[PDB]
Design a protein around this nucleic acid. Structure first.
Ligand code: ZN
Lengths: 49, 60, 84, 145, 303, 49
DNA sequence: AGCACAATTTAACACTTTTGTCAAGC
DNA sequence: GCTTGACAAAAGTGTTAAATTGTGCTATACT
C-alpha cells in the first residue's frame, strides 16, 4: 500500500464484501459459468455447477 | 495450609421444627491472627436430611 | 379531530404526523427515519441547546497557556527548519 | 383478515424493506426505568415506536379517552391506538458499518462463498477482519507504469 | 478461529515505548492541536503568515495525528492487562477492552509530559475508570444510574463487612445504621439491586415448556364479560328510554356514554344553553328517577 | 442480544467520530458483526453468547 | 471506588382558574 | 323552570427548591 497504493484498493469486513457484490455483473458471471464444456467430467465443472 | 486451621462450629441457630416453620435453613455458623466467620453451615438431622430454606432435602 | 403536520428530514424524506386539532404543533419531531425533522409551515422557533461538546483542544488549553504552546511550536518549527 | 390467501412468498429483505417496516429506530439499549418501571424513550419497548401500553393512552397522559384515535401526542410522541399494536409493530437499527447475514455466510454451503468464488474459510477471514481483500484495481495505470 | 485471539495478535505487533519516546509523541500531539487551532484562529482574526511557514504548520498536524495514533497503538496492551480483571461480571471481555480503549483515548488527550511521570501511571486511572463506568451503564438489562450502582455496591460492601464481623447477615437496622441511611431506604435499594430472569429458561422438567409459557395475559379480553358488558349497554339503553329526551342526553354527556368523554356541568349546560347549576339540578333528579325500584332493580346484578 | 448489538453499534459511531485508529475501529466492526450473528443464530459460529 | 459539578427531573408551593354546591330568589 | 352570588373544592399553572441523573476525574509504576 505504501507503494502502488494509487493503483488498487482493498478493505476488510462486511463493507468490502458489500463492494464485491456492488461491481458484480450477475449475467456476466452466469455466462462464464454457463460453460458446459471446459472438460466438466471432473468436479471442477460441478464446483461451478 | 499454609495459604487457616482450627475451624469452629457453634450450636445450631434454630431447631428443625423452627426452621421448617420460619422457612429458614438448618445451619450452624463456622469460624476459622484475624478470626474469620465463613458462613452458616447446613447441618444434617437425625433422619439424615437437611433443611435448606424450610424444606427437608436429601443428598443422594 | 386530527391535525396533519409534515416534517422534513436532513436526508430528504418526508413524514406525515397526525396530531390533535387543539394542541400545539412541535417544530421538530423524531421521525420513523430515526432522524430529527423540521416542520414545513408554522415557523420553527428551534432553541438549539447550543452546548459545544468538549474537544481535545479544550483539554489542552486548560493545562498549557498559549505562551507555552507558542514556545513548543517554535521548537518544532526550528526543528523542521534544521532538517532541511 | 379474509382467511383465504392464494400464495405465500419469501425473499431477501433489503435495508429499505427493513426501514419501511420499522416504526422508528431504537437508539438506546434501555428497557424500562428501574424506578417508574415504564418503557424508556428511544430504547427498547419505546411506546413512541412500538406502541402504547394502555388502550388509547399516550405516555404523558394528555390524551386518555377513546375519543381521539389515530393521532399522535405532541408531547410524548405516542400514537393513541389499541395496545395490541405493541405486538404487530417492529423497529430497526441503522448500523454504522454493514454486517453479513450469518445465514448466507456460515450456512453450508456458503451461499455468499458460492456467489463470489470465495472459499468459506477465505470468506470467514474477510468479514471478520482477518485479511484484506482487493476491491478495485486500475489496469491502465498499472500497465502504463 | 477465535476473535479475541485476533485482536491480541495485532496489538502485540506494536512496539512498546520508553519514557523518552512518550514525551516526544506527547509534544508532537500538543504541537498538532495548537498548529491546527492557530490556522483556524488566523482566518478568524484576518491575519496571514509566511507561505513556507504556514505550509510547515499544516504538516505539523499530519505528524501530530500520527503521534496520537502511534501513542494509542503502543499502550493497547495496558488496556487488556486491566480488562482481564473485570471478566464474568456481566460484560463480554471485548466490550471491556473497547471501553478501556475509550478511556485510553482520553488519557492521551489529557496526559502531561511536563510532569515527568511514566505514561502508564496516568493512563491506568482513565482506563480503569472507563471500564467501571461502562459496567454501571451497560452490565444490567434494566439500567441503573452510576450513583445508584455506586450506593448498591457500597451497601453490599458494608453487608459483606458487617457479615464478617457479626457472623450473621446484618438486619436492615444494623445495615442502615452503619450506612447512615433509613432502613426503608436500604430495603428500597435492595429491591433495585435485583436483576431479571430469563423467560426463555426451562422451568418445566426436561424442556417440557419454557418459563414464558406460564405467564398470563391479564389484559386479554374476557369473553363472558364482553357479552355481559354488551348486555349492560343494551339494558341501559332501555333505562335511558324511560327518562326525558333532554334528561337522557344529560346523563349521556355527564358520563360520556355517547362520545366517551364526560363533560362538566358548564359544558353540559352549554350544549343545552342553560346555567351550570341548572344542569346540576337536572342531574340530581335523574339519579333519583334512576334509583326508583322499577328502573333500578334490573341493574343490580351487574354490580 | 439486541442490547449487545445496539451497544456495540453506538460505540462504533463514537469511535468513528473520535478518529480512533483502525485497530480499535475494525475491532468494533468485528464485535458488531458477531453481535448480529448472535442475535440471529447464536452459537452457529464460535461459542454462543 | 469516590466525589465535584453541571444538567435535568421531580417536588413543592403559592396562586389563579375552574368546577361543583348550597342557598335564596326570579 | 330557571338564574344569581356566595363559597368551596378541585383542578390547573407558573415559580422554586430538592433530588435525581450524567459526565469528568484521580499523576510511583503497572503493557
Ligand atoms: Zn403524551
Amino acid at each position: 500500500q505504501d507503494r502502488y497504493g494509487e493503483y488498487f484498493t482493498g478493505a476488510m469486513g462486511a463493507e468490502s464484501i458489500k463492494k464485491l457484490i456492488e461491481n458484480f455483473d450477475i449475467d456476466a458471471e452466469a455466462e462464464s459459468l454457463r460453460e458446459v464444456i471446459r472438460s466438466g467430467k471432473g468436479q471442477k465443472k460441478l464446483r461451478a455447477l | 495450609s499454609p495459604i487457616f486451621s482450627d475451624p469452629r462450629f457453634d450450636e445450631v441457630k434454630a431447631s428443625v421444627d423452627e426452621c421448617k416453620d420460619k422457612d429458614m435453613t438448618y445451619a450452624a455458623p463456622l469460624f476459622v491472627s484475624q478470626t474469620v466467620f465463613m458462613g452458616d453451615f447446613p447441618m444434617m438431622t437425625e433422619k439424615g436430611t437437611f433443611i435448606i430454606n424450610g424444606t427437608e432435602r436429601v443428598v443422594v | 379531530p386530527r391535525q396533519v403536520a409534515r416534517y422534513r428530514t436532513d436526508n430528504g424524506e418526508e413524514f406525515d404526523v397526525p396530531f390533535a386539532d387543539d394542541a400545539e404543533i412541535p417544530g421538530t419531531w423524531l421521525c420513523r427515519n430515526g432522524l430529527e425533522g423540521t416542520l414545513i409551515e408554522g415557523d420553527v422557533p428551534e432553541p438549539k441547546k447550543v452546548k459545544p461538546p468538549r474537544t481535545h483542544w479544550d483539554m489542552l488549553l486548560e493545562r498549557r497557556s498559549v505562551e507555552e504552546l507558542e514556545e513548543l511550536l517554535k521548537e518544532r518549527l526550528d526543528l523542521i527548519k534544521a532538517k532541511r | 383478515d379474509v382467511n383465504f390467501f392464494d400464495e405465500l412468498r419469501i425473499g431477501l429483505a433489503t435495508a429499505d424493506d427493513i426501514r419501511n417496516w420499522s416504526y422508528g429506530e431504537v437508539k438506546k439499549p434501555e428497557t424500562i426505568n428501574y424506578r417508574t418501571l415504564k418503557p424508556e424513550k428511544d430504547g427498547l419497548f419505546c411506546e413512541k415506536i412500538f406502541g402504547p401500553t394502555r388502550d388509547w393512552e399516550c405516555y404523558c397522559g394528555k390524551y386518555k379517552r377513546v375519543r381521539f384515535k389515530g393521532i399522535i401526542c405532541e408531547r410524548c410522541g405516542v400514537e393513541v391506538t389499541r395496545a395490541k399494536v405493541r405486538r404487530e409493530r417492529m423497529g430497526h437499527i441503522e448500523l454504522a458499518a454493514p454486517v453479513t447475514h450469518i445465514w448466507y455466510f456460515k450456512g453450508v454451503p456458503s451461499r455468499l462463498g458460492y456467489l463470489l468464488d470465495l472459499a468459506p474459510k477465505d470468506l470467514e477471514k474477510i468479514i471478520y477482519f482477518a485479511a484484506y481483500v482487493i476491491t478495485s484495481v486500475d489496469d491502465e495505470m498499472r500497465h502504463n507504469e | 478461529a477465535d476473535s479475541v485471539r485476533a485482536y491480541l495478535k495485532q496489538i502485540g505487533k506494536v512496539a512498546l515505548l520508553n519514557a523518552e519516546e512518550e514525551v516526544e509523541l506527547a509534544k508532537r500531539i500538543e504541537a498538532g492541536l495548537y498548529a491546527t487551532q492557530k490556522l483556524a484562529e488566523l482566518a478568524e482574526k484576518g491575519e496571514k503568515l509566511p507561505v513556507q511557514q504556514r505550509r510547515d504548520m499544516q504538516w505539523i498536524c499530519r505528524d501530530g495525528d500520527r503521534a496520537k495514533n502511534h501513542l494509542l497503538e503502543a499502550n493497547l496492551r495496558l488496556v487488556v492487562s486491566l480488562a482481564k480483571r473485570y471478566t464474568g461480571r456481566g460484560m463480554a471481555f471485548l466490550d471491556l477492552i473497547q471501553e478501556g480503549n475509550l478511556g485510553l483515548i482520553r488519557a492521551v488527550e489529557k496526559f502531561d509530559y511536563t510532569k515527568g511521570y511514566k505514561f502508564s501511571t496516568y493512563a491506568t486511572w482513565w482506563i480503569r475508570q472507563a471500564i467501571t463506568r461502562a459496567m454501571a451503564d451497560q452490565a444490567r438489562t434494566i439500567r441503573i444510574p452510576v450513583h445508584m450502582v455506586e450506593v448498591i455496591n457500597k451497601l453490599g460492601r458494608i453487608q459483606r463487612e458487617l457479615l464478617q464481623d457479626l457472623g450473621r447477615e446484618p438486619t436492615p437496622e444494623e445495615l442502615a445504621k452503619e450506612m447512615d441511611i433509613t432502613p426503608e431506604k436500604v430495603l428500597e435499594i435492595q429491591q433495585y439491586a435485583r436483576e431479571p430472569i430469563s423467560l426463555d429458561q426451562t422451568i418445566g422438567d426436561e424442556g417440557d415448556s419454557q418459563l414464558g409459557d406460564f405467564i398470563e395475559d391479564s389484559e386479554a379480553v374476557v369473553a363472558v364479560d364482553a357479552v355481559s358488558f354488551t348486555l349492560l349497554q343494551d339494558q341501559l339503553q332501555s333505562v335511558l328510554e324511560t327518562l326525558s329526551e333532554r334528561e337522557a342526553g344529560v346523563v349521556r354527556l355527564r358520563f360520556g356514554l355517547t362520545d366517551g368523554q364526560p363533560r362538566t356541568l358548564d359544558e353540559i349546560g352549554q350544549v343545552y344553553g342553560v346555567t351550570r347549576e341548572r344542569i346540576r339540578q337536572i342531574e340530581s333528579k335523574t339519579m333519583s328517577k334512576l334509583r326508583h325500584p322499577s328502573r333500578s332493580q334490573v341493574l343490580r346484578d351487574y354490580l | 442480544l439486541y442490547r449487545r448489538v445496539i451497544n456495540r453499534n453506538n460505540r462504533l459511531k463514537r469511535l468513528i467520530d473520535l478518529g480512533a485508529p483502525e485497530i480499535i475501529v475494525n475491532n468494533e466492526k468485528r464485535m458488531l458483526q458477531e453481535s448480529v450473528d448472535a442475535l440471529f443464530d447464536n452459537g452457529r459460529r464460535g461459542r454462543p453468547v
